[PDB]
């Protein structure tokens, strides 16, 4: 349920606990720009590809 994060072992029951906020801000907030810009080049078809 991700309320806690870790790992469970089956042989002897060892809970290796670790933590890091990895990164989220840098890539996916720059990834959605690419699919915004894809729709801009799609909208270039409605004033260039049809027109000239």
């Amino acid at each position: 349920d991700k309320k806690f994060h870790g790992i469970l072992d089956q042989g002897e029951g060892v809970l290796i606990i670790f933590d890091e906020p990895p990164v989220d801000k840098t890539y996916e907030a720059a990834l959605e720009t690419i699919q915004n810009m894809s729709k801009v080049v799609d909208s270039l078809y409605n004033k260039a590809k049809k027109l000239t």
């Binding site: 840098t26 890539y27 720059a30 690419i34 810009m37 801009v40 080049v41 270039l44 000239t52």
Partner: protein, 286 residues
């Protein structure tokens, strides 16, 4: 005690014209004058100056003269014509730190408590900032003399002002490096300051001229810093200093990869903005 000094370009210039006016002596003269200014908020300010009559004979070079009546009345005029202005200390033209400047400062400290000096340049060639200033500290201390006193450099820069920025930027009208973009840093401190580090590596090479042949006082308090520099020489390339360096190249270049991707689309939208003005006028105009 003092954070830093602030020098205007007027007093920077107001020594050069006097260096021209005594330049007809030919043989030898240092320009020594009274430095005026108003230090506030623990920051040293320098505003105005003149120069006092001063001569020097080489045999027994401990004989100086300051015509204090010229110092009394002209400052009294300057205290009249600007009561905001006061004395801040003195200066000298400073090629090479002449010997009388150990007691010139002690001659006229009965006016300014922190009677600061300023060493300027008359023949400019460097890669740094050619204005230098010291401060007076004294010591009954470690090894040298019972009466010991050595000058210490407080950092120096040329302050600007809204009145004089009008003047100097009209007075330049010359080769300039404006339009700070991706290139001004490349030449103000990447072309230049790497060669600025030359003359500091080569400066301690010049003290190194005493290994068995140079001057007779040897080290004692010069090598504690030089022992530290090879000690504080940075970390070698074995640790995650390798790995976390590739980490941030793998982050900083992604922003450049996005930003360059945008640059191609924008000019392509500009390309259609010229194909709208090419085809839609050759039938219209001809």
């Amino acid at each position: 005690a003092v954070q830093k000094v602030v020098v205007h370009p007027l007093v920077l210039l107001s020594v050069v014209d006097h260096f021209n006016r005594i330049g007809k002596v030919g043989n030898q003269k240092r320009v020594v004058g009274v430095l005026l200014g108003s230090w506030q908020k623990k920051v040293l300010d320098v505003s105005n100056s003149f120069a006092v009559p001063f001569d020097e004979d080489d045999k027994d070079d401990s004989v100086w003269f300051l015509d204090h009546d010229y110092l009394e009345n002209m400052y009294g005029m300057f205290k009249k014509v600007n009561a905001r202005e006061r004395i801040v200390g003195w200066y000298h033209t400073g090629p090479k730190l002449h010997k009388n400047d150990i007691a010139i400062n002690e001659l006229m400290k009965r006016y300014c408590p922190n009677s600061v000096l300023v060493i300027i340049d008359v023949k400019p060639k460097d890669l740094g900032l050619p204005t230098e200033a010291y401060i007076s500290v004294e010591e009954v201390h470690d090894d040298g003399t019972p009466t010991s006193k050595t000058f210490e450099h407080v950092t120096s820069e040329i302050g600007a002002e809204e009145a004089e920025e009008v003047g100097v930027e009209h007075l330049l009208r010359d080769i300039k490096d404006t339009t700070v973009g991706t290139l001004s840093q490349r030449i103000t401190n990447q072309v230049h300051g790497l060669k600025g580090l030359n003359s500091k590596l080569l400066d301690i090479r010049s003290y190194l001229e005493k290994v068995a042949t140079g001057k007779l006082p040897i080290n004692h308090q010069i090598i504690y810093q030089l022992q530290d520099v090879f000690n504080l020489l940075p970390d070698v390339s074995l640790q995650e200093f390798v790995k976390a360096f590739y980490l941030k190249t793998n982050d900083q270049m992604v922003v450049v990869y996005l930003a360059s991707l945008i640059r191609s689309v924008v000019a392509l939208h500009n390309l259609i903005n010229n194909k709208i003005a090419n085809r839609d006028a050759e039938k219209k105009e001809g």
